[PDB]
Structure 1
Amino acid sequence: PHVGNYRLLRTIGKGNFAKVKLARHILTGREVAIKIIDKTQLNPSSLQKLFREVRIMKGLNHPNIVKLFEVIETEKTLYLVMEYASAGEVFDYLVSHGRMKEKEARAKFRQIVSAVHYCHQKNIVHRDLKAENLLLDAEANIKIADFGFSNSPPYAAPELFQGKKYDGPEVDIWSLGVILYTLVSGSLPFDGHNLKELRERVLRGKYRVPFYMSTDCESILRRFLVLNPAKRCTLEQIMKDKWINIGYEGEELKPYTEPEEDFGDTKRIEVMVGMGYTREEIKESLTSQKYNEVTATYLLLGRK
């Protein structure tokens, strides 16, 4: 019930290799989520994917992507201390509260587009965008989680169902069209019992659209759910769309740029010394994006 500066609370996730636990940072009192991985139970390729995952995580800084704080290493187990998305899956939110009204789907979807574009810019392709990997904080903001399979069938592009060419950003774009479709309707655009039916409908690319849907919504989905990855619209282009910006007259959705982070908050620096941190230790490990006990404590003292 303790690893590093963390008290392990309850398991909040379980995969076929990893488990996520809610934890409390004993110094700052902040809640975090730790993705626990037993490296001994992993085959050589998933071990390679876990190392890719940790690298990708290190190179991302967006307010709508679950952020890494600390990496606790042991011979047999890897500990990935990240943000805790308090309100859970969007999937659950939809079953619990019904389809989202377009103002709500727009608020959430703009964030997803900002976050997914940022990844493509920093040469990352999520490859697992599902409503499961989409979560919320207490202020109901999207936080894209996982990155295990980066560089599900109902969200998978037609080319991947065939076993065709790679490319990348385009496969995440088809998924975003599947996400928006669920956000506004509650259901998935393409389904069907056994895998053969789902494969057929994704490939035919035919989806019903509900009477309540706005004409601008039905249009914006056609830009994403393009059966041809080449003719599929780009995120820089879709960000300019009528729908994405309804009720955002001044602020049209433009690509995210990571701002200048202040690694010199005099108030958080002194408050750390009163715990056991030294001037030389803080300065040396803050200036450098190390992700250690020090870095984590400083980022957590401005979170609450």
Structure 2
Amino acid sequence: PHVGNYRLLRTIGKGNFAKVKLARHILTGREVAIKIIDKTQLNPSSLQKLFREVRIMKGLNHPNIVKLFEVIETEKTLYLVMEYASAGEVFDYLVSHGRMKEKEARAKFRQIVSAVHYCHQKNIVHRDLKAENLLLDAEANIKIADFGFSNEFTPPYAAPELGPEVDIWSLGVILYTLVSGSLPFDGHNLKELRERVLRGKYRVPFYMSTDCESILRRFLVLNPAKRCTLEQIMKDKWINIGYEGEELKPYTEPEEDFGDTKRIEVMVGMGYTREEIKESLTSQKYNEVTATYLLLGRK
């Protein structure tokens, strides 16, 4: 029932070595997801990469990337407390609600490209971008997950080869699925999905624009060597239709705002101290205090 300052609700996945549970922060009331890894059943050399990745994850601060809130360690279990993407995966939205119009696709594909660039600019490659890591918040906004983990977590969207080019392909496939509503390289067996992915030959539906087709080509080049850079593709005509004086730019992080008196007053009323709060936010130790500060500004 309880972990940290979090009441546990219901399980929402069970990968290899990791299981995610939906939860409810008692102090603030807000809603969160919690990845639970058993350290028991781990190669000690892997923990050197687990925590290494947890370091990167703390550095991720983008509106379309799942933010870390609190870390809770016991010698047995690691609890990672994250954002919950309430609306769920994108392809369950594309099967259920059909294809997206180029306006909606554009909106969502900007958020994606912003996030992936920012992460590339911090030398992070997902290399596993797929159906399950593209998510949506309540307000229908992209939330990319497990970006920077190499875990077991909880083939179509991957390149004909199988750093940044592995994702460029992946983005191309995603763009296709957004506008078309279907996978470019699907099928029954996995000997089939090679033939289609390796040819890269897709079908261009009648409703897809010429501009959209054009940008699709930039992404899905069969030689990674000639594939276009996200830096460039941010300037594509298609990507910036309807965003005239808002041409897509690389995401730059906000300043620290660790001095919100109104939140601190509340936290003081929760039993924390001014010193505890200051020490905790500065050191960025992702403790009960840092979490409570972030959740208190979430909505």
TM-score (ref. length: structure 2): 0.95
1:273 matched to which residue of 2?
A: 268
Asked whether the 8 Å contact 1:20–1:33 carries over to 2, the reply is yes
Q: C-alpha offsets along residues 76-99 of structure 1, whole Å, 9 cap, x if unaligned? A: 111000111111111111111001
Moved over 6 A (4+): none
Asked whether the 8 Å contact 1:49–1:148 carries over to 2, the reply is no
- Cα 1:46–1:208 change in 2 (3 A) is farther
| Displacement of 1:194 | 1.9
Provide the rounded CA distance (Å) in 1 between the counterparts of 2:293 and 2:261: 11
Provide the rounded CA distance (Å) in 2 between the counterparts of 1:150 and 1:240: 31
Q: C-alpha offsets along residues 99-152 of structure 1, whole Å, 9 cap, x if unaligned? A: 111111101000000000000001100111112211111111101011364599
1:163 matched to which residue of 2?
A: none
- Cα 1:35–1:274 change in 2 (3 A) is same
| Displacement of 1:195 | 1.7
Matched, 1:235 2:237: no
Match of 2:197 among 199, 202, 212: 202
| Displacement of 1:53 | 2.8
The percentage of counterpart residues that share the same residue type is 100
Provide the rounded CA distance (Å) in 2 between the counterparts of 1:139 and 1:212: 26
| Displacement of 1:8 | 0.7
- Cα 1:229–1:99 change in 2 (3 A) is same
1:153 matched to which residue of 2?
A: 155
| Displacement of 1:261 | 2.3
Asked whether the 8 Å contact 1:174–1:225 carries over to 2, the reply is yes
- Cα 1:150–1:229 change in 2 (3 A) is farther
Asked whether the 8 Å contact 2:56–2:148 carries over to 1, the reply is no
TM-score (ref. length: structure 1): 0.94
SS of 2:161's partner is helix
State the number of aligned residues.
297
- Cα 1:60–1:43 change in 2 (3 A) is same
Provide the rounded CA distance (Å) in 2 between the counterparts of 1:147 and 1:236: 19
- Cα 1:154–1:44 change in 2 (3 A) is farther
Task: Report the more deviating stretch, 39-48 or 7-16.
Answer: 39-48
Provide the rounded CA distance (Å) in 2 between the counterparts of 1:50 and 1:193: 34
2:34 matched to which residue of 1?
A: 34
Task: Report the more deviating stretch, 47-56 or 125-134.
Answer: 47-56
Q: C-alpha offsets along residues 249-282 of structure 1, whole Å, 9 cap, x if unaligned? A: 1100010000102100011111111111011111
Provide the rounded CA distance (Å) in 1 between the counterparts of 2:134 and 2:279: 35
Consecutive unaligned residues of structure 2, counting only runs of 5 or more, are none
| Displacement of 1:50 | 2.6
